[PDB]
């Protein structure tokens, strides 16, 4: 579970 930007955006957090 590493959050990345490229080549796929995989960040999972949603701002409150």
């Amino acid at each position, epitope marked *: 579970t590493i959050x990345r930007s*490229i080549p796929w955006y995989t960040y999972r957090w949603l701002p409150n």
Partner: antibody, heavy 123, light 108 residues
Framework: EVQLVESGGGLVKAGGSLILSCGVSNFRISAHTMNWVRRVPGGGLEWVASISTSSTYRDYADAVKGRFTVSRDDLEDFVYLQMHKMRVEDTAIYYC????????????????WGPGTVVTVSP | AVVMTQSPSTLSASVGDTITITCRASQSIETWLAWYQQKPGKAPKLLIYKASTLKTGVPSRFSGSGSGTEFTLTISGLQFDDFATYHCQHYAGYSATFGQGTRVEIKR
């Protein structure tokens, strides 16, 4: 007092890659969410990317998601934008901008902008 | 995916006029709205934030109002230096959305 300056703009062929940087004067970026914005030839502004404090969260416009990555270097006060698989519609003036206010809140406007750097993608 | 729509896209007016740019959002954004001025070749300048708050240094002839889905920027007594492009912006913690921009030009 506060200044921002972009470097790296240029002419790139479609499908190519280009990296931009942003430096500052008279403040530290560390406490600021830093952003990239572009003005397309039509004249309108488009939000491109945001990089929060501690580099924990990064968000991108749908048009560039999967292709662009933003990075920050707090110790030397730099922000970067990598652009890959570039397209004609990426052609624009790119600005580095900070979210800020006299007292930082959870949601401040873009109070300081760089002059911009021109990026051109040939078809 | 909030859509910000400015109106009109081009606004033709004369010096001394009083004009109104409208920005409407496709859904409620409370007062998280800012207005920017931009002249050709130059950086955007923040004029107003939180829908109606004037940034220090900005002349009182600039005025912002609105909430929810409808917002207006009014310039009272348009001056030559006010001819420029104006952008509204929905700003959130980690993203933003801009209108298409409104260019204010000399009417003829």
């Amino acid at each position: 007092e506060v200044q921002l300056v972009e470097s790296g703009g240029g002419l790139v062929k479609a499908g190519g890659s280009l990296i931009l940087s942003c430096g500052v004067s008279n403040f530290r970026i560390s406490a600021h969410t830093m952003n990239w914005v572009r003005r397309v030839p039509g004249g309108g502004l488009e939000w491109v990317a945001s990089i929060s404090t501690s580099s924990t969260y990064r968000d991108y416009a749908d048009a560039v998601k999967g292709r662009f990555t933003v990075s920050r270097d707090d110790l030397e006060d730099f922000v970067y934008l990598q652009m890959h698989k570039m397209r004609v519609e990426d052609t624009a003036i790119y600005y580095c901008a900070r979210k800020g206010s006299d007292r930082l809140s959870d949601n401040d406007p873009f109070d300081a902008w760089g002059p911009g750097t021109v990026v051109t993608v040939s078809p | 995916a909030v859509v910000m729509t400015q109106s009109p896209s081009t606004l033709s007016a004369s010096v001394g006029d009083t004009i109104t740019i409208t920005c409407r959002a496709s859904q409620s954004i409370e007062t998280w709205l800012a207005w920017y001025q931009q002249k050709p070749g130059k950086a955007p300048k923040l004029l107003i934030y939180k829908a109606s708050t004037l940034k220090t240094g900005v002349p009182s002839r600039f005025s912002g109002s609105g909430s929810g889905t409808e917002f207006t920027l009014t310039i009272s007594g348009l001056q030559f230096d006010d001819f420029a492009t104006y952008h509204c912006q929905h700003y959130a913690g980690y993203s933003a959305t801009f209108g298409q921009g409104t260019r204010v030009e000399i009417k003829r």
